[PDB]
Amino acid sequence: MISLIAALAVDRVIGMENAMPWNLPADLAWFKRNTLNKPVIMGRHTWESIGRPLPGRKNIILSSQPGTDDRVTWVKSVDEAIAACGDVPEIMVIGGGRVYEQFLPKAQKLYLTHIDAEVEGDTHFPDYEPDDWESVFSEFHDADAQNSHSYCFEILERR
Numbered sequence: 001m002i003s004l005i006a007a008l009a010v011d012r013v014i015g016m017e018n019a020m021p022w023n024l025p026a027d028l029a030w031f032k033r034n035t036l037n038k039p040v041i042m043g044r045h046t047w048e049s050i051g052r053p054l055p056g057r058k059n060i061i062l063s064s065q066p067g068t069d070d071r072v073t074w075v076k077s078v079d080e081a082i083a084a085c086g087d088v089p090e091i092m093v094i095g096g097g098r099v100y101e102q103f104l105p106k107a108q109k110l111y112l113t114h115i116d117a118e119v120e121g122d123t124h125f126p127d128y129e130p131d132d133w134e135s136v137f138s139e140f141h142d143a144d145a146q147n148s149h150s151y152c153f154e155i156l157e158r159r
């Protein structure tokens with residue numbers, strides 16, 4: 001099973017200048033809980049944005065060019081990325097925009113954080129047809145001293 005996990009600001013913005021400009025510790029904790037002990041697939045730009053391997057996960061990087069770091073697994077196509085995960089229950093696709101586009105048609109589940117923040121951005125999460133997806137979990141949180149925007153965690157499953 002393939003799942004996508006992402007955090008979206010207003011208008012589905014996910015990034016600006018190869019970065020995420022907000023800081024929401026509660027959402028990073030949610031990301032860690034939902035990805036630990038699973039393979040994670042990311043594109044090369046997202047790998048450069050994170051800047052190090054994510055511990056406790058098999059890190060798989062998509063790039064058309066040879067890898068430059070043997071602490072992670074480098075693959076050259078979507079099918080190779082999936083194969084490199086092996087026989088696991090759930091593969092997590094962690095972006096960025098181009099990678100989410102390619103994996104969305106193959107995904108059964110979306111883990112989305114909706115952040116109440118207006119961000120100039122240059123990267124968006126794909127338009128997804130709402131009729132295709134059922135919301136199975138949602139949890140709203142007001143802003144607090146650690147998290148400067150309100151946010152909603154949602155899990156959607158393909159109908």
Ligand SMILES: NC(=O)c1ccc[n+]([C@@H]2O[C@H](COP(=O)([O-])OP(=O)(O)OC[C@H]3O[C@@H](n4cnc5c(N)ncnc54)[C@H](OP(=O)(O)O)[C@@H]3O)[C@@H](O)[C@H]2O)c1
Pocket residue numbers: 005006007008013014015016017018019020042043044045046047049062063064065075076077078094095096097098099100102123
């Ligand atoms: N808010 C969030 O949840 C979230 C999550 C992830 C990322 N982001 C943000 O998203 C942005 C990065 O997204 P992006 O769309 O620019 O880049 P991306 O999807 O991370 O990376 C694209 C790169 O991945 C490689 N790639 C993708 N598909 C491939 C394929 N089928 N075969 C081979 N290589 C493939 C290519 O690398 P080569 O050029 O080396 O071939 C391509 O240039 C950053 O701003 C980041 O902070 C946000």
Ligand SMILES: Nc1nc(=O)c2nc(CNc3ccc(C(=O)N[C@@H](CCC(=O)O)C(=O)O)cc3)cnc2[nH]1
Pocket residue numbers: 005006007020027028029030031032046049050054055094095112113
């Ligand atoms: N829900 C969600 N939120 C995000 O911010 C997010 N970000 C990415 C891409 N960027 C990043 C950037 C940093 C870390 C990261 O350092 N994660 C640590 C958390 C511990 C910490 O630094 O606070 C991890 O071990 O997972 C992960 C993804 C992909 N999916 C996401 N999904």
Ligand SMILES: [Mn+2]
Pocket residue numbers: 077079
């Ligand atoms: Mn092929």
Ligand SMILES: [Mn+2]
Pocket residue numbers: 086087
């Ligand atoms: Mn198999």
Ligand SMILES: [Mn+2]
Pocket residue numbers: 116117118148149150
């Ligand atoms: Mn806000």
